[PDB]
Amino acid sequence: QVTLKESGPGILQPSQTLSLTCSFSGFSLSTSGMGVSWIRKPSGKGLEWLAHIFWDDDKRYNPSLKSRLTISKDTSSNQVFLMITSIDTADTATYYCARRTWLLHAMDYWGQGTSVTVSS
Amino acid sequence: QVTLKESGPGILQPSQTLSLTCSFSGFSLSTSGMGVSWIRKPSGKGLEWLAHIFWDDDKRYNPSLKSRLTISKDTSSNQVFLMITSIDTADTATYYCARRTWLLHAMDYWGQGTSVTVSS
Amino acid sequence: VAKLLLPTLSSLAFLPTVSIATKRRFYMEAMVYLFTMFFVAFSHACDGPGLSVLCFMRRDILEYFSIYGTALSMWVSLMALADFDEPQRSTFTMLGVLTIAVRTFHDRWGYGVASGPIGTATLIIAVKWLKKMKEKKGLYPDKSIYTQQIGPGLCFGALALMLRFFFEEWDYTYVHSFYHCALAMSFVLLLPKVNKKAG
Amino acid sequence: VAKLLLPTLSSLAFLPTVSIATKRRFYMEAMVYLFTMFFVAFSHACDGPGLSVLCFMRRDILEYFSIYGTALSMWVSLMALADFDEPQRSTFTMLGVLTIAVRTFHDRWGYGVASGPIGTATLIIAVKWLKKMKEKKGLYPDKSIYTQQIGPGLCFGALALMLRFFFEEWDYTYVHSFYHCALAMSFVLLLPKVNKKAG
Amino acid sequence: DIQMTQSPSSLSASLGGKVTITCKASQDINEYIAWYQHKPGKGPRLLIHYTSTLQPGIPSRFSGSGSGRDYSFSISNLEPEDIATYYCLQYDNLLWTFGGGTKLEIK
Amino acid sequence: DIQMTQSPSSLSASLGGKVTITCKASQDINEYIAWYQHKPGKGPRLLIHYTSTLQPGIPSRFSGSGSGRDYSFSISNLEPEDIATYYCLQYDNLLWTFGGGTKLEIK
Ligand SMILES: [Zn+2]
Ligand SMILES: [Zn+2]
Known part of the structure; x- marks a missing residue:
C-alpha cells in the first residue's frame, strides 16, 4: 500500500497564518529521488499547484x-x-498533498484532501 | 523629379462606392519591378495600408x-x-498613394494625400 | 555462389534505415545512411570474386568511405538521440565529421575508429542527460525511451561490435551479413520517433 | 630564410577568420576554419626545408586535409551566407562534407575539387534568392549585403582562385602567401553579421 | 508559468460511447503531460503520464496522444464509473500547472 | 497580419537634444523596418530603410538600429524642423503594417 492524509484547522478568521499537515505512509520522503507536492482547488475553480519539498x-x-x-x-x-500566511477569501478551497516519484515526475498518489475556509 | 497626386470626391453619403485616382509623374508603372501602394489615415488614428498594384x-x-x-x-x-465599396464612418480619413521601387521595397515617394468624409 | 554474394546482398539492410529516417524528417541522418549503404555495398561488391569486375572506383577509396561512412552513421544516429539545440547541434555534428575523417585516414582497420566516436558520443550524451536529470530531479528520457529506443538500440550496438571485432575470427560470409543487419537496427532504434527541428 | 617560411607564417591569415566567426556565434564555421588553419599550417611546415623535421603526421594525410579543409571552408562560408532553415541546413551542410570528401579523395590536385562546391553552392544560393526575389517582388538581400558582403566576398574569391590556379606559375613564396590572405578575407566577408539560429 | 487549456469545460457523452478531451499548452512542453481523473469527493488518480503511457492498473479504454502544444485524452466504451472531472497536468517545469478541467457527464 | 508598436505615443524633447523612438514587432521581421517622418499637413518622407540605411539627402543626425522584433529610431541635435510625427513601417511581407506613430514635440 501507499497512503497520504491531509489535516488542518478547517475554519479560521481572515488575515491569519495556518499550518496544514500531510502524513505519508507505505514509503518515506527520506528515499533518494522521492518528493511531495501540495495542490489546492479553490471552490468553483480548476486545480492550482502550491509547493514542493524533496x-x-x-x-x-x-x-x-x-x-x-x-x-x-x-x-x-x-x-x-x-x-x-495572511489567509483571505481566495483561500476558501480544498487542499491536497500528492507524492511524486523519481521515475514518473507527475504525482502518482494523492491524499483525500481537506477543506479550508475563512469566516467571522 | 518624381511626383504623385491623389484625387477624389472629398464628400459623399454612407453606403456608396467611390473611385480615388492617383496620377504619377517622373516615372511610369510600366517600368519592370515598379509598384504603387495606397495607404489611408483615419481621423485621429495611425497609418493603415490598403492596396498594391505592380x-x-x-x-x-x-x-x-x-x-x-x-x-x-x-x-x-x-x-x-x-x-x-460600401463607404462608412470608419472611412473618414486622409487617403495617400506611394510609389514603391524594386531595390527598396518600402515606398520612397508619397503624394500630398486627399481628404475623404461621409456625411448627410 | 551465395557464400561470396551475402556480404554484398546484406548491405541492403541499411535501406530500411534510410526509408525510416526520411519518413521521420531526419534528412541529414538519411544522407549518411544512404551514402554508407552505397559505399558498403560497393566495398563488398569489389571484394567478392563473383562480381568484383563491375566496379568503377579504386579499392583505396571504397575501403576508407565504407569504414568512415559506418563510423559517421554511428555518430549522427547518436547525435540524433542527444537532440542538441543550436549552435551545439551543427557544432557536435561537425566534431564527428572532422574527428572520424582524420582518425579513419590515420588507421582505418584499428577498432579505435569506432570506439572513439561511440565513447565521445556517449560522454556528450551523459553530460547533457545528467545535467537534465539534475534540472528535473527525475529520470530525464522517459522510461519508455530507455526500454524501447536506448536499451534495444545499444543492445544491437553491442551485438554489432561483437560480430565485427570478435566473431569475424570464425566467418566473413554470414557473421559479416548479420553485422550489417544488427547495425541497421541500431540506427533505426537510436533515432527518435520524429525530428523535433523539422516536424 | 623568409622565402621558405612565408607560406607557413601566412597560414595564420585564417586566425582573424576563426576569431571573427566565434565572435558572431558561428561555432560550426569556426571549427572548419580552425581545422583548416591547423592542417594548412602543417601542410606547408612539412613542405618547408627550414622546419619540415618538426611534424608528426605523414604527407598523404596533411595534403588531403589542407585541400579538403580549404574546399569545405569555401562551402560552409557559402551555406552560412545562404542561411537555410531546418532540416535543409543540416542537409546542405552534409551535402558539402560528403561530396568534397569523395571528390578530394578521387583527385585532390584537380581544380574541380574547388569548382564543384563553389558552382553547386552558387546554384543552391541562386535557387533560394531567385525564389525569395519572386516572393518579395524586389532585390532580396538588401543592396547593403550586395555592396558590403557578397560583392567584396566574391571579389576576394576571384582573387584567391586566380592567385592559386594561375599566378602559382610565377611564384610559390609570396603568391601562395597572398592566396592565404585573399581566401581568409572571403571567409570573413561571406559570413553574415550574426548567426540568426544562435543570436 | 505556462497557462494550460482544455477545449470542453464540460462534455455530455453516452454510456458505452467515446470522448476526445483535447488540450492546448501556451508553449512547447516536450510531451510532459499527465492526465488525472478527479472522482467526486475523493483523491484524484493518475491515468496517463508522458502524454501516452498508462499507469499500471488502468483499463486500456483510456488512451492519450499528441505532441508539441496539443494533446488529446480519450475514453473508449465509457462506463458509468468514468463519469468524473478530468484534468491535464503540465510537468515539463517543476512549476506545474493543471488544465481548467473537463466535467465529463452522462448524455 | 503583424501588429507593430512604438513605445512613446508622444515624446517631448528639447531643441538640440536627442530622442530614441523604440519599436517592437509581434514576431521576427528580418530587419525589413523603414522609418518615416509625417510633417504636419504634407506627404511623408522615407528617412531610413532596412532598419539602418539612410535615404540619400537625409542629414546624418537620424540613425536607426536593432534586429529581431526590437528596432530603435534616433534623432541627434534635433532641430525645430524635426518636430513631426514619426512612423515605422514593417515591410517583410507585402502585407505592410505601420506602427501607431510617435507625435514628437518641443519641450
Ligand atoms: Zn560491411
Ligand atoms: Zn596553402
Missing part, C-alpha cells in the same frame, strides 16, 4: 503566491507541513 | 478590408485607381 530538502513554490508560502518536513514523524 | 499587373489588399477593395491602373494616362 529527498535533498530542496523546495519550490507557485511564484504568484511565493510571498506567503512556507513548506517544511519531519521524516522522523513521516510528515510534511505547508504554512500559508 | 508592373506585372499583380495586386494585393489589406485582408480585413479585402471584401470591399478593388484597384486598377491605366499606364497610357499615367494613373492608378482605388475603388472602395
